[PDB]
Write an enzyme that holds these catalytic residues in place. Sequence first.
Site, short mmCIF file in Angstrom:
data_model
loop_
_atom_site.label_atom_id
_atom_site.label_comp_id
_atom_site.label_asym_id
_atom_site.label_seq_id
_atom_site.Cartn_x
_atom_site.Cartn_y
_atom_site.Cartn_z
N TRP A 83 0.81 -1.21 0.00
CA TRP A 83 0.00 0.00 0.00
C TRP A 83 0.84 1.27 0.00
CZ3 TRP A 83 -4.60 -2.20 -0.64
CH2 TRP A 83 -4.83 -3.45 -0.06
N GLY A 119 -7.40 5.45 4.95
CA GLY A 119 -7.69 6.30 6.10
C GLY A 119 -7.56 7.79 5.89
N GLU A 199 -12.90 1.26 -1.36
CA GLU A 199 -12.65 0.41 -0.20
C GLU A 199 -12.10 1.26 0.94
OE1 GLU A 199 -9.82 -0.79 1.46
OE2 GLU A 199 -10.86 -2.30 2.66
N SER A 200 -12.48 0.90 2.16
CA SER A 200 -12.07 1.61 3.37
C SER A 200 -12.42 3.09 3.26
CB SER A 200 -10.58 1.43 3.62
OG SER A 200 -10.20 2.02 4.86
N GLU A 331 -12.20 -7.66 10.07
CA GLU A 331 -11.89 -6.26 9.81
C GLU A 331 -10.84 -5.73 10.78
OE1 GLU A 331 -12.76 -4.38 7.40
OE2 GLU A 331 -14.45 -5.40 6.45
N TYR A 334 -6.24 -6.36 11.44
CA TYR A 334 -5.12 -5.62 10.88
C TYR A 334 -4.64 -4.52 11.82
CZ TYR A 334 -2.48 -2.73 7.55
OH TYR A 334 -1.51 -1.99 6.92
N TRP A 436 0.55 -11.78 5.79
CA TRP A 436 0.20 -11.54 7.17
C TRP A 436 0.09 -12.86 7.93
CZ3 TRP A 436 0.85 -7.15 9.46
CH2 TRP A 436 0.73 -5.95 8.75
N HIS A 444 -8.01 -6.31 6.70
CA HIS A 444 -8.74 -5.19 6.10
C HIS A 444 -8.13 -4.85 4.74
CE1 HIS A 444 -11.40 -1.71 6.20
NE2 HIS A 444 -10.38 -0.96 5.81
#
EC number: 3.1.1.7
Lengths: 540, 540
Positions: A83, A119, A199-200, A331, A334, A436, A444
Site C-alpha cells: 500500500w 484512512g 474500499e475503506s 476487519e 489488521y 500476514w 482489512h
Amino acid sequence: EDAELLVTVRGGRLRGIRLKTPGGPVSAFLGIPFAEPPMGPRRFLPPEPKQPWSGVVDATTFQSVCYQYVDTLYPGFEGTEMWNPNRELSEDCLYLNVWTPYPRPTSPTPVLVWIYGGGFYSGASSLDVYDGRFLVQAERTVLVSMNYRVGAFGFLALPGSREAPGNVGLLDQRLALQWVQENVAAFGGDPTSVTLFGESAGAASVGMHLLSPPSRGLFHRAVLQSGAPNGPWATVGMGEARRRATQLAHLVGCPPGGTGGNDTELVACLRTRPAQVLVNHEWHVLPQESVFRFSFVPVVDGDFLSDTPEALINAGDFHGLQVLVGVVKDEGSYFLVYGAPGFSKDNESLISRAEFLAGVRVGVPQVSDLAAEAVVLHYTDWLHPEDPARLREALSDVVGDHNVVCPVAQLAGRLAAQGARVYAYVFEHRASTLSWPLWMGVPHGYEIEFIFGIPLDPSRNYTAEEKIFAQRLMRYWANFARTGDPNEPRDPKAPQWPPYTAGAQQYVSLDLRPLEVRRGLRAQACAFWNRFLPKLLSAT
Amino acid sequence: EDAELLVTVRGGRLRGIRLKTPGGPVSAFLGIPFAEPPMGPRRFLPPEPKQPWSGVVDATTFQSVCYQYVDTLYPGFEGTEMWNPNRELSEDCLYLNVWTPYPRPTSPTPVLVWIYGGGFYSGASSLDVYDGRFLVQAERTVLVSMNYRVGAFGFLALPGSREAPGNVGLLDQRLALQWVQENVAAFGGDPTSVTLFGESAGAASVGMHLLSPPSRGLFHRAVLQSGAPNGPWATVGMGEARRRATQLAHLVGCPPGGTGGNDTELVACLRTRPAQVLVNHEWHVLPQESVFRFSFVPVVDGDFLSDTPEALINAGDFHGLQVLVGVVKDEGSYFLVYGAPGFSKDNESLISRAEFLAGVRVGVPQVSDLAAEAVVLHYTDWLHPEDPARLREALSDVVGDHNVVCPVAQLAGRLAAQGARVYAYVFEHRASTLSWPLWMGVPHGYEIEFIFGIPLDPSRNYTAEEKIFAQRLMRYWANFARTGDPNEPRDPKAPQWPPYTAGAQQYVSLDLRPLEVRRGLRAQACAFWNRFLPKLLSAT
Ligand SMILES: O=C(/C=N/O)NCCN1CCCN(CCNC(=O)/C=N/O)CC1
C-alpha cells in the site's frame, strides 16, 4: 503506431499505451491531468480545472503520488509495503487513469470509478493491486481511477475561513467525476452509467458522494467495501479539526512567536513550510493513543456535508439508486498490531485479559469507563473469560464491529428501507499468497486484489481455484455496473444473490464455494453499537 | 397393637399412624407441637418452646395451616389449588411432621428436613405433594417437615423494635431444627447428619440458615431448589420494611385517629385485629405493579442476618460443607400470568412488542429507564424483534434469570470457590399430568412432585417412565443426604455427576434420558445481571 492509442479530450491530445493480459490487450491512458497543480498559494485550496494544453501529453505511465505518510514499521514486508507509494511524492499529483478495452467499444459502455482507501492519510491509484487491466479485459467495461489529496493537503480544515475550508480532497474526487462525465465518451464510455466503488476510506468517500447533492448527478450506482461515511473515524467535528490544524501549525513553527493568530496568518504560514515537514508531524496531532483513528479527515463543515453523515442517511430519499455493500471476515485484526498492547505480527498474539482490558480503551478511544465495562461484557465469553485465543479474536471483533461492520450494516439497512436497492456480502477467502500471520484471518482490504483480477497475472503464484474465483467476483461487480444486479441477467444455474432488506437482512458469502445466503450482519453485536451505547453516552 | 406408633419425646408421648405405599408401610407422626401457639400478645414475637404435656398427643392428621393469602385467581384449577391450604387456617399452626420407615431403623439414619416455599407469604407442610411416604419407604431415611409463620405474622418487621423485630418466621424454622437435634433420635434418626432441603422461598430459607451462625450448628448439608437468599425478592431493606409495616397498619386502622404512632403503639393496635383482616391487605402494600415480589420477606437487621445475604456469601468460609443447588428449565414462565401485560394461561400468550416492553418494567421493578433498555437489549432477538413466540420466552427468561437462575448461579460459584462442594442440576421434564398451558414448559416448583415420589401413588395417572424417573431422583437426593455425594458409591457404571466449580461450571440435566453434563448456568445472561447491572445502577 496504433490509431486507438491516440485520443483527444476537451483539454488536449493524449497518447495511451497497450497492456498485455493473458486473454488480450487493453488500451490504458495513465496520468491525464484533470486539475491545475495545487502548489504554492493553492495549498489547502479546492482544485481548479486543468487548463487546455497544446500538443500530445504522454499518458504511458503513472504520475506522481500525493504527499503522505509512509509505513516503515515493517521494512521489506509485503503486507504493509503493497500500500506504500510506488511513484515519487509531489504536491503535483492530481491525475487520473483510464482503462478501455481493445478494440475500443463502438457502443457506450458502463464506467467503473475506483476510489482508493487509506484512512484519508495515504493511498494512490498507481498501486499494483489497483491495476484494472484484468477487469476491463474480462468484462469489457471502462475503468477510471483518480488521485486525490490525502493528509493535511487534502483534509486540513479551519472551518469558516477561506484559506482552509477542508474537504478539498473530496473536491478532488468530484472534479475527476466531472472530468469523466465530460470525457469518458471519447474512450468509449457511457457517462449515463457511472458506477462508483471504493474500499475503506474510499468506501467512506463513495458514501459521502451519495450524501453530497452536487456529486449525486455525476454517477448512478455505488459500491462501499469495508467502509461507510457514518463511521467513528470517517468524520470529525469542526471544533476538533480546528484544534488538530492549530497543533500541526504549532509543531512546525506557525505562528512565529509571537505574531499570531487568526486563520489568515496561520494558513499563510503553513504554505511556506515544505510538504514533507507537514507530513512528519501528522500522527502527533491525534488526541489520544488509539487504533483505526486518523488525523486529517473529512469534516462536517456545512458546505460539502450540509449535516453529519448520520443525519443525511436518515433523512434522504434513495429511490432509483442501486448500492452494493460488504465487509471482510476479520476487519479489526489488521489494526491491532498498530497500538493494541501485546500484539505482534510475528507471534500468535495470545494476549492476557489485562492486555484485553487495556486494548478496549485503545480500540474504543474517547469513551467513559462505564461504557468500556459494557464493551467488555458483550465481547467476553464468560465460560472462558481468560482464554488468550478467544480474547485475541474478541478484540479483533471489537475494532471490526465498531469501525466497519456495524457502521456499514447501519447504512445498508437504512438505504433499503428508504427506496434503495441494496446487496450485501461477506468476503471469507484468505489469499494463498497472504504474507500476514494466520491468526488475522482475512485482514482489512485483502479482497481488492480479487476484485481487480490480480490472480490472472501469470507472474503471480495464485492457485487455479483462485483464478476461477476471481472471475466470478469480477462478473459480480461488472454485472452490478451494467444492470445494477450482481446476479446473471439470464443464467439460473448459479445460485441467487437476494437483496439485503431492512427486515430479512440477507447477505451472501463470497469464497471458493458457491453462494450461501445468510441472515444478519452481526445483528446482535451491532445492536449494541447502533442502539444501546448512544443512549449510554447521553447519560454519562 | 403395633408398638411402633407410640414414641416418647422430651415433651411427652405421641401416637402416630401407619401409611401404606405400594412397596410397604411407613410410620408417620403428623402434628407434633414444637412451640407454644403465637396468639394474642405473642403475635409478631419470636417463638417459645412448647411446654411439656400430659398423656398422649394424637399425631394422626396434619394440624392447621398458618394464616396466609389463598389464591382464587383460577377457581377449581389444580395448578393453583395444589398450593392452597388443605387444612383450616389458624394462628396456632407451629407444628412439625416426621416420617420414619417400618421397621424403625435400629441404626441412626440420616435425616432430611423439608422447608416449603411460596414467596414467604403462603405454604403448608400438609400439602399432598409434600407427602414423604414414598421418599422414606424407598430409601429408608427420616423425613421431617415443619410449619413456619408466613406473611405479616412471620415477617412484619419494625427494625430496631422489640415487639416487631422481624424474621420470626425464620426463627420458627430454627426452633424446629433445635427440636430435631433433641428428638429425631427417638424416631431412629441421626442428629449428626441432618440435611436441609427446600424450594423457592424455602430454598432461600435454607440459604439464610447457612449464613446465620446460630443455625449453622443445626445441620450439615443444604439443598436449594430454584431459590437463593441473595435474590432480589428474598430480603428487603430496613427503611422499606418499616414503610411496609406502617402501610399495613394504616390500611387496618392503626393508629386510631388522634393517637401517637411509635413502634409500641403500632403493634399493640395490630395485635387487637383479626388475623384475616391483616391478610386481606397484604398485596396492597407492594410499592408498584410487579411480579415475583412479595410484601413481608426476611429483613436484614443485624441479628439473624448480621449483614445482607450477598455480603455474607462473599465474606464466608464454607469448608466442610456440601451443597446441591439447581433450577427448572422455565423459571419465570409461571409468574407472567400474574401481572405481565398480554399473558393468559388459557391462550398461547403471543404478546406484542409493546407488551414486551411493558412486561420488562413489571418483571424488573424499580430500575431506571436506561437500565431497562439494557435488559431489553440483552433479551431480544434483533433479527426477529417482533416475533410473539420469541418475545414470550424472552420475558420468561427475564423474570426467570433475574429472580432465580442468576442469583442461584452466583451463590453456587461463590460456595465452591470458597470451600464448599457444590452440585448443580437443571430439571427439564414436564409432568405428563401437568395442568398449566404448554408454553410454560416446566414452571416454577414442578419438580417437587418427582423428588417426593408422587408418581408412585397408584391413584394418579403418571406413566411408567415417570415412575422409574422418580426413583432415580429419590436416590440422588438420598445419596446426598447420606454421603454428601449424589452419585452411587458402589457404582461406576451409571453416568457420573461432576461437582460444580467456579471455573468449569459443570451441571447436569435431569430427565428421562441418562445424565448429560453441560457447562455454563446461563453464563452470558447472568454476567449481565450479576456483574454489569450493579455497575449501571450505581451511576444511575
Ligand atoms: O490499510 C489500510 C487501507 N487499506 O486500503 N488502512 C490504514 C491502516 N492503518 C492501520 C493503523 C494506523 N496506521 C498505522 C500506521 N501508523 C501508525 O498508526 C503509527 N505509526 O508510527 C495506518 C495503517
